[PDB]
Design an enzyme around this catalytic site. Structure first.
Site, PDB file in Angstrom:
ATOM      1  N   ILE A  13     -25.197 -21.516  39.878  1.00  0.00           N
ATOM      2  CA  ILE A  13     -26.129 -21.650  41.024  1.00  0.00           C
ATOM      3  C   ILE A  13     -26.573 -20.290  41.567  1.00  0.00           C
ATOM      4  CG2 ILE A  13     -25.425 -24.028  41.577  1.00  0.00           C
ATOM      5  CD1 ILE A  13     -23.617 -23.008  43.803  1.00  0.00           C
ATOM      6  N   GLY A  14     -25.786 -19.250  41.352  1.00  0.00           N
ATOM      7  CA  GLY A  14     -26.133 -17.916  41.827  1.00  0.00           C
ATOM      8  C   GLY A  14     -25.370 -16.826  41.117  1.00  0.00           C
ATOM      9  N   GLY A  16     -24.220 -12.835  42.260  1.00  0.00           N
ATOM     10  CA  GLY A  16     -24.178 -11.752  43.229  1.00  0.00           C
ATOM     11  C   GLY A  16     -23.917 -10.427  42.551  1.00  0.00           C
ATOM     12  N   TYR A  18     -21.093  -9.198  41.697  1.00  0.00           N
ATOM     13  CA  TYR A  18     -20.078  -9.366  40.643  1.00  0.00           C
ATOM     14  C   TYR A  18     -19.939 -10.800  40.261  1.00  0.00           C
ATOM     15  CZ  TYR A  18     -18.893  -4.783  42.430  1.00  0.00           C
ATOM     16  OH  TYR A  18     -18.960  -3.465  42.816  1.00  0.00           O
ATOM     17  N   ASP A 146     -23.973  -5.104  52.435  1.00  0.00           N
ATOM     18  CA  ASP A 146     -25.025  -5.650  51.579  1.00  0.00           C
ATOM     19  C   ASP A 146     -25.783  -6.757  52.275  1.00  0.00           C
ATOM     20  OD1 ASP A 146     -26.704  -5.659  49.374  1.00  0.00           O
ATOM     21  OD2 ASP A 146     -25.385  -6.984  48.223  1.00  0.00           O
TER      22      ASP A 146
HETATM   23  O1  LIG Z   1     -21.367 -13.425  44.604  1.00  0.00           O
HETATM   24  C1  LIG Z   1     -20.611 -13.782  45.599  1.00  0.00           C
HETATM   25  O2  LIG Z   1     -19.728 -13.075  46.048  1.00  0.00           O
HETATM   26  C2  LIG Z   1     -20.890 -15.139  46.144  1.00  0.00           C
HETATM   27  C3  LIG Z   1     -19.788 -15.934  46.446  1.00  0.00           C
HETATM   28  C4  LIG Z   1     -19.960 -17.199  46.965  1.00  0.00           C
HETATM   29  C5  LIG Z   1     -21.234 -17.708  47.187  1.00  0.00           C
HETATM   30  C6  LIG Z   1     -21.387 -19.056  47.762  1.00  0.00           C
HETATM   31  C7  LIG Z   1     -20.409 -19.685  48.654  1.00  0.00           C
HETATM   32  O3  LIG Z   1     -20.892 -20.912  49.066  1.00  0.00           O
HETATM   33  C8  LIG Z   1     -22.102 -21.104  48.470  1.00  0.00           C
HETATM   34  N1  LIG Z   1     -22.868 -22.183  48.627  1.00  0.00           N
HETATM   35  C9  LIG Z   1     -24.035 -22.223  47.973  1.00  0.00           C
HETATM   36  C10 LIG Z   1     -24.476 -21.183  47.133  1.00  0.00           C
HETATM   37  C11 LIG Z   1     -25.789 -21.297  46.445  1.00  0.00           C
HETATM   38  C12 LIG Z   1     -26.393 -22.539  46.279  1.00  0.00           C
HETATM   39  C13 LIG Z   1     -27.624 -22.656  45.655  1.00  0.00           C
HETATM   40  C14 LIG Z   1     -28.271 -21.536  45.192  1.00  0.00           C
HETATM   41  C15 LIG Z   1     -27.693 -20.298  45.348  1.00  0.00           C
HETATM   42  C16 LIG Z   1     -26.465 -20.176  45.977  1.00  0.00           C
HETATM   43  C17 LIG Z   1     -23.662 -20.050  46.979  1.00  0.00           C
HETATM   44  C18 LIG Z   1     -22.453 -20.019  47.660  1.00  0.00           C
HETATM   45  C19 LIG Z   1     -22.337 -16.913  46.901  1.00  0.00           C
HETATM   46  C20 LIG Z   1     -22.179 -15.636  46.380  1.00  0.00           C
HETATM   47  C21 LIG Z   1     -23.413 -14.818  46.071  1.00  0.00           C
HETATM   48  C22 LIG Z   1     -24.225 -15.308  44.868  1.00  0.00           C
HETATM   49  C23 LIG Z   1     -25.649 -15.536  45.362  1.00  0.00           C
HETATM   50  C24 LIG Z   1     -25.544 -15.680  46.808  1.00  0.00           C
HETATM   51  C25 LIG Z   1     -24.429 -14.727  47.205  1.00  0.00           C
END
Ligand SMILES: O=C(O)c1ccc(-c2coc3ncc(-c4ccccc4)cc23)cc1C1CCCC1
Length: 282
Positions: A13-14, A16, A18, A146
């Site tokens: 879904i994402g 970041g 790392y 960030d």
């Molecule tokens: O890289 C990390 O450290 C990291 C860790 C946890 C989440 C996250 C926790 O709860 C969430 N609910 C939803 C989403 C989400 C849902 C849809 C599309 C994009 C992100 C992401 C998270 C998100 C991230 C990053 C990755 C892109 C956004 C920031």
């Protein structure tokens, strides 16, 4: 999909700073979560190869300590405008590390640049959430480092949660005293982009990044921009802040953004003052 203990790991879904984040279904409580997946060896390699012994910029001796610091930081934070870490899966004999978070359904508020900025009133609602989250982090002696719209996730309730604690730092005392810092180039404060004998405040870096974020919220692009990294750094340090002719925003919002993007961190507005700014309290 794949099974990991009680979780079924699904689509990415994402991504970041790392690792990667997957959607994960918990079979025990019939709930979806967001799971960050990391490789310990890859995290170590991301810091660079260690230098041979010789005869402000020294590589960290133990690079893996940063992810364990991120985990410790997340475990300390419980606030409605901050992501919630619920579990860490870490077998000492395995290379992978998994961090389980409560899901924030709608994903990032914006991915800069966009041609579709927020209205002034919606930007105010999200910025009020951002203030509350940052004020809490700073009270807990955490600098995020960030802050940008793509790290601000919108929940089912239409409120933002601050995410991606990958480069966050916990400090001792009243503020973080930094010689250098990490960040996304277009959101880095001018004081962090010079070769100098002066350390700088970590909290004021977060304020500068909140300023760039707020400008992005209403305009859809950063105030200082160039595809050439040396030119981007030069503009952040020496170009005067300007606002486009359209969309026409309120004069009090221009005042607030101007104060957050003061190039001098000594006179830059602080979070206690931002909370009481007339644009914020309207
Ligand atoms: O890289 C990390 O450290 C990291 C860790 C946890 C989440 C996250 C926790 O709860 C969430 N609910 C939803 C989403 C989400 C849902 C849809 C599309 C994009 C992100 C992401 C998270 C998100 C991230 C990053 C990755 C892109 C956004 C920031």
């Amino acid at each position: 999909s794949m099974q990991l203990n009680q979780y079924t790991l699904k689509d990415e879904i994402g991504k970041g700073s790392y690792g990667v984040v997957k959607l994960a279904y918990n079979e025990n409580d019939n709930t979806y979560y967001a799971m960050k997946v990391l490789s310990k060896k890859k995290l170590i390699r991301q810091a660079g190869f260690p230098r041979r012994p010789p005869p402000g910029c020294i590589q960290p001796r133990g690079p893996i300590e940063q992810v364990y610091q991120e985990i410790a930081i997340l475990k300390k934070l419980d606030h409605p405008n901050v992501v919630k870490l619920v579990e860490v899966l870490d077998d000492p004999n395995e290379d992978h590390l998994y961090m389980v978070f409560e899901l924030v359904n709608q994903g990032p508020v914006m991915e800069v640049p966009t041609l579709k900025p927020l209205s002034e009133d919606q930007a105010r609602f999200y910025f009020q959430d951002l203030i509350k989250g940052i004020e809490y982090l700073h009270y807990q002696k955490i600098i995020h480092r960030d802050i940008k719209p793509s790290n601000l996730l919108v929940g089912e309730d239409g409120h933002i949660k601050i995410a991606d604690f990958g480069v966050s730092n916990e400090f001792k005392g009243s503020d973080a005293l930094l010689s250098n810092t990490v960040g996304t180039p277009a959101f880095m404060a001018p004081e962090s982009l010079s070769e100098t004998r002066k350390i700088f405040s970590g909290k004021a870096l977060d304020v500068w990044a909140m300023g760039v974020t707020l400008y992005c919220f209403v305009f859809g692009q950063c105030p200082f921009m160039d595809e050439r990294i040396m030119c981007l750094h030069s503009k952040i340090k020496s170009q005067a802040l300007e606002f486009p002719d359209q969309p026409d925003i309120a004069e009090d919002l221009k005042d607030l953004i101007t104060r957050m993007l003061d190039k001098n961190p000594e006179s830059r507005i602080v979070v206690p003052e931002i909370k009481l700014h007339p644009w914020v309290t309207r």
